[PDB]
Structures are given as structure tokens and as C-alpha cells.
């Protein structure tokens, strides 16, 4: 039983009429969906949780529908959001829709027969829907009394200064209708999402009964968090131009022990048997396994190898294996960086990079043999960089002591 | 000062930025509007209060716009309504729209130059409006925190079983946008309505500022009520719903505590004439005659001179007993709603007509009441208990009016 398997990974927050869903799942392939709103040019790690859950259902033989909210992204989901969001333009949302659709696509199989993935966009039905049609055909089925009692919008209905527009309050009807629309178009009988989506999902379940006299189900995944109560993603984007594969990999390497086994369950396709065996062995490595799996999953074999090669070069101080693209990752977000004019001396580099507070202090630090230039020791306080030390004519990696790095990017 | 004149008739509940509105009114003609939703095939007396107020503004030189809610009638106004209304069909609402627009038209002047009245319909702009456009362009300007606390809908938001749909909750936004539309299309700067419309009006004022960067105003008329606290069922303007006779009699029977206020609300008599009529009644030493004046004015206004003459002829014939002056059309007003009526098969005796009309409990009782000379047939006394009606007594071959005592009537409609 797939629900039982997901419950064992800790991937089930809530599920509607669970016994019936397990029976329908047991009978044969179902169509299911999860929606993703375009509120940025990329998804982050949080979005990856239900995205991989769509693939977990596909691996079990079910048909995943990945919806991108071209219409809902023009409205804004208020669910457990403390503040009203500014509206985004139609041009910006369309740009984001395209980027998200393309980012989701490699996570699912679009060519595996009957259960092949389908990309959907709710702008296809809301983009031309008349307002009186929406209010009469959809709105009459929604009770404002029940809407104001939804946990997701309750904290917004106490004081107007921390309030909600009619625009964001109508959001629940759009996602509610999306479920009914996918049920009629594709026979979708299940919607998944994170726990904040519970109220938007149950509205679609109810609306599908009222509009199409069909029974549909809901399943939420817990919102993934760190055990120490801090905010998850200290954000971690899927786009390599926002979070480099190296930074992505390092985020996983540095997972706390209290989080590492839970993260392996949420973010990898490793069996529950191997994760438990990995946990027992360490009680009498997991961060390394987690980093390898998720980095290869998001950034591919090439991405994982670049992240490992950069990590190794920084640990060893030997930079010969680094390519120009590797240095681009370091400058982006890998190590602290400073832009400098060619001709600057070593003292000025240490001051401008904030590795040293003054030229006088930097002189003593250099003379003490604390500084490396591309991994090589340089103890002449009066030194000027050689042209060959400007790797790819652009980069020079400084290190103070055994671990304090700074990348000089030459103008 | 038009606002002050309306305040003296008791026709002003609330006014936004009153000094600025009075200054705008004194500068020259303005364009104003009032909306009427199609929830029935006719307007009633309540709807007549703001409709006549549109005419009062027109008489002062202003330009009235009478909007009929082709779109809003497909949504439903929840304002101060205890229960959620069922949605009406597009075909039914269209039929009602046509009937209401035609019923409204004779009350305003459509041919008096620059301030000629205009007929409008909000279906013109909502019929082709996309949902994302409405939600973004209009909806972003509305706070749900403020909406749920509006007096017109707050009572609906405590019991789920006695609740409000998103459909009816969205209504305030539609009427709000209508004011922005009429401001842009016709330079409408004022909306009037009854006091239940205050919140729908102020939403339009705020939205016009946000969308068109224009200053507009609101003025409400008090909801006309009775002094005894009872409900002001309905008295319709359509003669096929409320006959001119019944309409006239409703005004005749106005309570003394209500008659002068009703003159101010429902007629175009000057405040000086109404005050002189109250003064005369206060010093006459007899019962008031103002009800007669009110009945003549409003019946002539709504049903014309012909309607008034029919109501008076029917009243006079019932009072005199002599029905010779009654036409077939007059008897049809009586059968519709003038007096209680019963359908009976020709051949029924007087005793059975008294029992079936519920004028008597039994034939045995009917026998004694007939013998006591308490029964009239078409105003003529009939004291024979064993009497059968004559063919000549079935007026126009199908009407006989029975009366027990001085006022217990029943029209027999012969089959
Ligand atoms: N930290 C996290 N852990 C687990 N899941 C997480 C998460 N952060 C985000 N998610 C989930 O990732 C998904 C996409 O996030 S989202 O774009 O903010 N979601 C939304 O705004 C949905 N209303 C989108 C939507 C859903 C269905 C529709 O028919 C239409 C639109 C949601 O299911 C959300 O719960
Ligand atoms: N007893 C009464 N006394 C005085 N005025 C009364 C009344 N009963 C009804 N009215 C008024 O008669 C007018 C029409 O009544 S109604 O058809 O119920 N009105 C409505 O439902 C409004 N929402 C119509 C409307 C108004 C403006 C728009 O842009 C669109 C529609 C309103 O101004 C109402 O306040």
C-alpha cells in the first residue's frame, strides 16, 4: 500500500477518506495532480517535496499532472501568509510560468505510455472565464462563513492593518475549481501538496462533489522544517544561476544530525530499508549520501561532479582542477568575493577583502606565513600579484589561515 | 439649497461630504443615478421612494440616470436580508429587466434637453468582463476585514446555516464598479438610494477615487416605514399585481401618524401645501382629510387619471350599494384583490352562497341572518331565506356582490 509506504517516510501530514483512497490506489492507476504558483523565476527546496511525491506516485504506476498557476499566480495564494502580496504583471507571470514548467518537466516522465505526465496551466480555463459565470457557477457553492473559518486565512481576519483583499480571499475558489476541472478533463481523483494547502484542497474535493457528483481525494505532505525550530532553506533555489550546484551540495553536507534521516526520506528515492540501515550504522556518512543523491537529482551527474571537485579543491588548496565555470560558482555564492582593479598589491587585496583591517596589520599577517594565493604560500608583505596568478585572467583565490577564503574577481 | 429642501421633507438619511455636494449642486446641473435590481416583474412602493427622488433632482435641473441591474440581478443583493436568495435564470432576469425599465420610464423626463433622463444597464460592462480582470482591477481595492464588518452583511456572518455565499458577498464590488462606470461614461457624480444601500454606495465612491481619480458623492433616502413599527404582502406598481382600487384604498387607510410623511415621500406637493394641510387637520375639529389627498395624488401619479377615476368609482359603488356604474373591468379589479371572492356554479341558492363565501358558518345560521334583513345582493336587501338569485343579478353574466352587515363583502364569480 502506497499510502502506508509514504506514511513510513513521514511524507503524509493528512489524507481524506484514507481507507477508500488506499482501495482505489490498489485497484489500478489513478490520475493525480499538484499545483505550483509562479511567484518567482524558480522553484526552491520546499516545492521539491510534493514535486518528488508526484514522481513517487508515477513510479507506482499512477499518472501525474503538474499544474503551473498561470491564473492563480495573477491572484496570489494567501494560505498561512502573514501579509498581502503585491500583484505581479501578466508579462512577468508568463515569463515565470515558462521557467517553472521547464524546471518541473525533467522530474517526471512524459513518455511512458498511459501514465505519462501532463503539464497543465489554470490560465487555460480562467483566462477567458466571464465574471458572472464564475460568481454564479462556482461562487454559489462557497459559504463565506466557512471561508473565514479556514485556518489558512484566519490570522488575516483579525485586524485590517494585517488584512486580506477580496482578490486573495477569492483564491480558494480558483484552486477549488482547478480540482473539478482536472477531474472532468483528465479523470484526476487526487490532489497532493504541502500541509498549508489543506484548505484549498478540501474546497476542490467539496466543489467536485457539487459540480460533477464525483468523489475525489486529498493528501498533504508535512512542511519540511529543521529540528532546531529554524526556517528551512538557510532560500535554496533549484536554478543553478540562483543557488550554484556547489552551494546546493554544501547545504546538504552541513545538514544537522537531527534532520539528515528525515531529509533523506523527503528528498531522495532511497528505500526506507537503506535509510534505516544507514541510521543504525551511524548510531554505533548520511550527510554525504544526502548531498550526493539530491545534487545528482537536481543538477545531474555533471553538477554533482562540479560540486565535489570545487569542495575538494577548496579543502586541498590545489586549484589546478578548477575550470572557469567552477570559478563562476565560487564568485556567485561559493566563497566571499571582492571585485578589484588589476595592479592592486597583496596588502590592498587583504584590506579590501576584509581579511585584514589595515595595511600595517596585513603586512604582519603576510610575514607570519598566514596567506595563500591560489593555494601557494606568499610571505612577502610587499608582493604584487603576477599575471599568471590571475587564473583565466580573472580570478585569484586568497586564503587567510587554514579556512578563511576570499575570491578576487579582476576588473 | 436642494439638500436642505429634501431634509425638510424628511428625505435625507445620510450624505457624504455634504458641504462639497451642496456647493457642486449650487454651481450647476450634475448627473446622478439610482439602481433597481430585477428581482420581480414589477417595482413596489418602497422602490418608488428613490425613483421619485430622481425626479425631484431632475425638477431642480439635474440629470437622472435610472440603472436596471441586468448583471446585479444575476448575483443578488444581500443588504439587510436575513436569507440567501435562490439564483434566477438569465431568461427570467431579462424579462424582468424589460418590464422594470418600461415601468420606470414614465416617472422621468426623457425629453427636456441637456438634463434628459438616461436608462442604463450594468450587464453592458459585466457581460464581457473576465474573472481575473474583476478580481485584480476591482477586487484588490476591497478589504475583506472591512467587508465582513459592514452592517448590511455582518448578521449573515455568525451562523453557517443562516449564511452568505461568495456570490452574494461579491455583490458590493459590482455596485461599487457601476458607480465608477457611470462616472466615466456620463460624468455621474452622485448616487442615491434607500438607507440599506449606504455601504454599496460608499464602496462605489472609494472605488471611483482609486480607478478614475474622481470625487463622487452619496445620498440616501430613509427607508419609509410606519410609525407603529409594523412592516411598510407588497403594494406593487403593476395594476395586474395590485389593482388601482386596492392601491387607492391602501392610501385611504394610512394611519394619521404616517399621512403627512407619506405626502412628503410619495407626492410632488410643496412642503408649504403639506404643512397647511396638516394645520387644517389639526384645527378642523374633525377626522383628517389628508388621506383623501394622498390617495388622489399617488393613484393619479402611478395609474393616471383613468386609474384614479376607476378606484373612486369602485369605492363609491361599494359605499352606495348601487353597482350600475361598475364596468366589467371594475368587477375584474374587485375579483383580483378588491374584496374577498369565491367561484360558484350558477344555480346555487342564497344560503349556499353565504356558506361557501364564508359569510355564514352553516345554512341554518344563513337562514336566520337572511330573515333578519342583514344581507344585500348587489346592494339590494334580500330577506327571503329560500331565495335563488335571478339571472339579471349575475352582472355581466358572472358577478354578484354579497354583503353581510355594513362591510363584510364577498364577490361571487359565477362559473
Ligand atoms: N517547506 C515545504 N515543505 C513541503 N512542501 C512545501 C514546502 N514549501 C512549499 N511546499 C509546497 O509546494 C507546493 C507549491 O508551492 S506554492 O507554489 O506556494 N503553492 C501554491 O501557491 C498553490 N496554491 C499552487 C496551486 C495548487 C493547486 C492549484 O489548483 C493551483 C495552484 C505546495 O503544495 C506547497 O505546499
Ligand atoms: N421601503 C423603502 N423605502 C425607501 N427606499 C426603498 C425601500 N425599499 C426599497 N427601496 C430602495 O429602492 C431601490 C431599489 O431597490 S432594489 O431593487 O432592492 N435595490 C438593489 O438591490 C440595489 N442593489 C440596486 C442597484 C443599485 C445600484 C447599482 O449600481 C446596481 C444595482 C434601492 O435604493 C432601495 O434602497
For the residues of B142-163, what is the DSSP string, one character each?
Answer: -BHHHHHT-HHHHTTSS-GGG-
Q: Which of A196, A221, A246 is the last residue of a domain?
A: A221
Q: Are residues B127 and B42 in the same domain?
A: yes
Distance of CA B76 to the CA centre of its chain: 19
Q: Are residues B96 and B141 in the same domain?
A: yes
**For residue B384, how many other CB atoms are within 10 A of its CB?**
10
Q: Are residues A101 and A14 in the same domain?
A: yes
Q: Are residues B282 and B296 in the same domain?
A: yes
C-alpha span between B403 and A36 (Å, rounded): 78
C-alpha span between A266 and A95 (Å, rounded): 29
C-alpha span between A359 and A116 (Å, rounded): 64
Q: Are A41 and A96 in contact (CB under 8 A)?
A: yes
Q: Are B49 and B224 in contact (CB under 8 A)?
A: yes
Q: Are residues B265 and B356 in the same domain?
A: no
Of A338, A330, A316, A337, which is closest to residue A249 (Cα–Cα)? A330
Distances (CA, A) of B390 to B348, B378, B399: 11, 11, 12
Q: Are B105 and B166 in contact (CB under 8 A)?
A: no
A-contacting residues in B 72-111 (Cβ below 8 Å): 74-75, 87
Q: Are B179 and B188 in contact (CB under 8 A)?
A: yes
User: Does the CB of B283 have a partner CB in chain A at under 8 Å?
Assistant: no
Q: Are residues A165 and A62 in the same domain?
A: yes
Residues with CB under 6 A from ligand 2: B 34-37, 46-47, 49-50, 67, 69, 72, 77, 122, 175, 178, 193-194, 196-197, 200, 221, 223-224, 232
Q: Are residues A164 and A252 in the same domain?
A: no
C-alpha span between A23 and A30 (Å, rounded): 11
A392: phi > 0 → left, psi -120 to 50 → alpha, else beta; which? left
Facing residue for A134 by CB, picked from B131, B143, B163: B131
Distances (CA, A) of A108 to A1, A66, A102: 21, 9, 11
Look up residue B162 and give its three cell numbers. 443562516
Q: Are A34 and A221 in contact (CB under 8 A)?
A: no
A12: phi > 0 → left, psi -120 to 50 → alpha, else beta; which? beta
What is the whole-number distance in angstroms between the Cα of residue A242 and the centre of ligand 1?
Answer: 20
3-class secondary structure, B61: coil
Look up residue B33 and give its three cell numbers. 443615478
Q: Do A144 and B132 touch (CB under 8 A)?
A: no
Look up residue B348 and give its three cell numbers. 346555487
Distances (CA, A) of B152 to B157, B164, B195: 11, 11, 10
Does residue B176 belong to any structural domain of this protein? Answer: yes
Of A37, A43, A44, A49, which is closest to residue A12 (Cα–Cα)? A49
Q: Do B165 and A140 touch (CB under 8 A)?
A: yes
Residue A409 sits at φ, ψ, to 5 deg, of -110, 105
SS (H, E, C) chain A: CHHHHHHHCCCCCEECCHHHHHHHHHHCCCEEEEEECCCCCCCEHHHHHHHHHHHHHHHCCCEEEEEECCCHHHCCCCCCCCCCCCCCCHHHHHHHHHHHHHHHHHHCCCCCHHHCCEEEECHHHHCCCEHHHHHHHHHHHCEHHHHHCCHHHHCCCCCHHHCCEHHHHCHHHHHHHHHHHHHHHHCEEEEEEEHHHHHHHHHHHHHHHHHHCCCCEEEEECCCCCCCCCCCCCCCECCCCCCCHHHHHHHHHCCCHHHHHHHHHHHCCCCHHHHHHHHHHHHCCHHHHHHHHHHHHHHHHHHHHHHHHHHHHHHHCCCCCCCHHHHHHHHHHHCCEEEECCCCEHHHHHHHCCCCCCHHHHHHHHHCCCEEECCEECCCCCCECCHHHCECCCEEEEEECCCEEEEEEEC
DSSP B140: G
Of B366, B414, B374, which is closest to residue B392 (Cα–Cα)? B414
B76: phi > 0 → left, psi -120 to 50 → alpha, else beta; which? left
Q: Which residues pair with B31 in a beta bridge?
A: B63, B188
Give the DSSP H or E segment for B66. strand B63-68
Q: Are residues A307 and A371 in the same domain?
A: no
The CATH number of whichever domain residue B182 belongs to comes to 3.40.50.620
**For residue B264, how many other CB atoms are within 10 A of its CB?**
18
Q: Do B167 and A71 touch (CB under 8 A)?
A: no
Distances (CA, A) of B289 to B103, B262, B285, B286, B295: 30, 14, 11, 9, 10
Q: Which experiment gave this structure?
A: X-ray
C-alpha span between B103 and B409 (Å, rounded): 32
Q: Which residue has the cell 535509510?
A: A275
Kind of pairing, strands B63-68 and B118-121?
A: parallel
Look up residue A213 and give its three cell numbers. 457528483
3-class secondary structure, B82: coil
Closest CA–CA distance from residue A348 to any residue of chain B (Å): 53
- Residue closest by Cα to atom 12 of ligand 2: B47
**A370, HSE (Cβ side, Cα atoms, 13 Å):** 18
The CATH number of whichever domain residue B343 belongs to comes to 3.10.290.10
B300-306: long-range pairs with CB below 8 Å, 24+: B301/B266, B301/B267, B301/B268, B302/B48, B302/B237, B302/B244, B302/B247, B303/B239, B303/B244, B303/B247
The CATH number of whichever domain residue A242 belongs to comes to 1.10.240.10
DSSP B42: S
Q: Are B97 and B47 in contact (CB under 8 A)?
A: no
Q: Which ligand is nearest to the CA of B76?
A: 2
C-alpha span between B373 and B350 (Å, rounded): 13
Give the DSSP H or E segment for B358. none
3-class secondary structure, B248: helix
Residue A343: Cβ-neighbour burial (10 angstroms; 0-12, 13-18, 19+):
exposed
C-alpha span between B343 and B411 (Å, rounded): 9
C-alpha span between A53 and A67 (Å, rounded): 14
C-alpha span between B192 and B12 (Å, rounded): 10
C-alpha span between A251 and A249 (Å, rounded): 6
Interface probe for A, chosen from B85, B144, B147, B153 (most Cβ of A below 10 Å), is B144
Q: Are B157 and A145 in contact (CB under 8 A)?
A: yes
C-alpha span between A83 and A281 (Å, rounded): 45
Q: Do A157 and B164 touch (CB under 8 A)?
A: no
Look up residue A232 and give its three cell numbers. 528551512
DSSP B171: H
C-alpha span between A73 and A94 (Å, rounded): 9
Contact list, B121 vs chain A (CB under 8 Å): none
| Helices (H), ranges, B191-320 | 198-212, 244-252, 256-266, 271-283, 290-320
Q: Do A169 and B144 touch (CB under 8 A)?
A: yes
Q: Are residues A26 and A101 in the same domain?
A: yes
Q: Which of B199, B221, B243 is the last residue of a domain?
A: B221
C-alpha span between A154 and A79 (Å, rounded): 9
C-alpha span between A201 and A207 (Å, rounded): 10
Does residue B22 belong to any structural domain of this protein? Answer: yes
Q: Which ligand is nearest to the CA of B224?
A: 2
Q: Which ligand is nearest to the CA of B261?
A: 2
Contact list, B74 vs chain A (CB under 8 Å): 132, 136
Look up residue A269 and give its three cell numbers. 528515492
Q: Which residues pair with B380 in a beta bridge?
A: B377
Q: Which residue has the cell 539530491?
A: A294
- PDB resolution in Å: 1.9
Q: Are A372 and A378 in contact (CB under 8 A)?
A: yes
Largest CA distance in chain A: 82
Distance of CA B124 to the CA centre of its chain: 26
C-alpha span between A353 and A372 (Å, rounded): 14
Number of domains in chain A: 3
Position in ligand 2 atom list of the atom nearest CA B182: 29
Range of the domain at A350: 335-411
Distances (CA, A) of A306 to A23, A136, A324, A327, B375: 45, 56, 11, 10, 112
C-alpha span between A213 and A141 (Å, rounded): 13
Look up residue B221 and give its three cell numbers. 433616502
Q: Using the CB atoms, write b or e for B91-118: b if 16+ within 10 Å.
A: eebbebbebbbebbeebbeeeeeebebb
Q: Do A164 and B147 touch (CB under 8 A)?
A: no
Q: Which residue has the cell 565555470?
A: A325
Q: Are residues B40 and B146 in the same domain?
A: yes
Q: Are residues B280 and B390 in the same domain?
A: no
Q: Are residues B186 and B291 in the same domain?
A: no
Residue B158: Cβ-neighbour burial (10 angstroms; 0-12, 13-18, 19+):
exposed
Q: Are B140 and B170 in contact (CB under 8 A)?
A: no
Q: Which of B162, B193, B221 is the last residue of a domain?
A: B221
Amino acid at each position: 500500500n502506497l499510502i502506508k509506504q509514504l506514511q513510513e517516510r513521514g511524507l503524509v501530514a493528512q489524507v481524506t477518506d484514507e481507507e477508500a483512497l488506499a482501495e482505489r490506489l490498489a485497484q489500478g492507476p489513478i490520475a493525480l495532480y499538484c499545483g505550483f504558483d509562479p511567484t518567482a523565476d524558480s522553484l526552491h527546496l520546499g516545492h521539491l517535496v510534493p514535486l518528488l511525491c508526484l514522481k513517487r506516485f508515477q513510479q507506482a504506476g499512477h499518472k501525474p499532472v503538474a499544474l503551473v498557476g498561470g491564473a492563480t499566480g495573477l491572484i496570489g495564494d494567501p494560505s498561512f501568509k502573514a501579509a498581502e502580496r503585491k500583484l505581479n504583471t501578466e508579462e512577468t507571470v508568463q515569463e515565470w510560468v515558462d521557467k517553472i514548467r521547464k524546471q518541473v518537466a525533467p522530474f517526471l516522465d512524459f513518455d511512458c505510455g498511459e501514465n505519462s505526465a501532463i503539464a497543465a496551466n489554470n490560465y487555460d480555463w480562467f483566462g477567458n472565464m466571464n465574471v458572472l459565470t464564475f460568481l454564479r457557477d462556482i461562487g454559489k457553492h462557497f459559504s463565506v462563513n466557512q471561508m473565514i473559518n479556514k485556518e489558512a486565512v484566519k490570522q488575516r481576519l483579525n485586524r485590517e492593518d494585517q488584512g486580506i483583499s477580496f482578490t486573495e480571499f477569492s483564491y480558494n475558489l480558483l484552486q477549488g475549481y482547478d480540482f473539478a476541472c482536472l477531474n472532468k478533463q483528465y479523470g484526476v481523483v487526487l490532489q497532493i501538496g504541502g500541509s498549508d494547502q489543506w484548505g484549498n484542497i478540501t474546497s476542490g474535493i467539496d466543489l467536485t462533489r457539487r459540480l460533477h457528483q464525483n468523489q475525489v481525494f486529498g493528501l498533504t505532505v508535512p512542511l519540511i522544517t529543521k529540528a532546531d525550530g529554524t526556517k528551512f532553506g538557510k532560500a535554496v533555489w533549484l536554478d543553478p544561476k540562483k543557488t550554484s550546484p556547489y552551494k546546493f551540495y554544501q547545504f546538504w553536507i552541513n545538514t544537522a544530525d537531527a534532520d539528515v534521516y528525515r531529509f533523506l526520506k523527503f528528498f531522495t528515492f532511497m528505500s526506507i530499508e537503506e535509510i534505516n540501515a544507514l541510521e543504525e550504522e551511524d548510531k554505533n556518512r548520511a550527510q554525504y549520501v544526502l548531498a550526493e543523491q539530491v545534487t545528482r537529482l537536481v543538477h545531474g551527474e555533471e553538477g554533482l561532479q562540479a560540486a565535489k571537485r570545487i569542495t575538494e579543491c577548496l579543502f586541498s588548496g590545489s586549484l589546478s582542477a578548477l575550470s572557469e565555470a567552477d570559478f563562476e560558482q565560487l564568485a556567485q555564492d561559493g566563497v566571499p568575493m571582492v571585485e578589484m582593479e588589476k595592479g592592486a598589491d597583496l596588502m590592498q587585496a587583504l584590506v579590501d577583502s576584509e581579511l585584514q583591517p589595515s595595511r600595517g596589520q596585513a603586512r604582519k599577517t603576510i610575514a607570519s606565513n598566514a596567506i595563500t594565493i591560489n593555494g601557494e604560500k606568499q610571505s612577502d608583505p610587499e608582493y604584487f600579484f603576477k599575471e599568471e596568478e590571475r587564473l583565466f585572467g580573472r580570478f585569484t583565490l586568497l586564503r587567510r589561515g587554514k579556512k578563511n577564503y576570499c575570491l578576487i574577481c579582476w576588473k
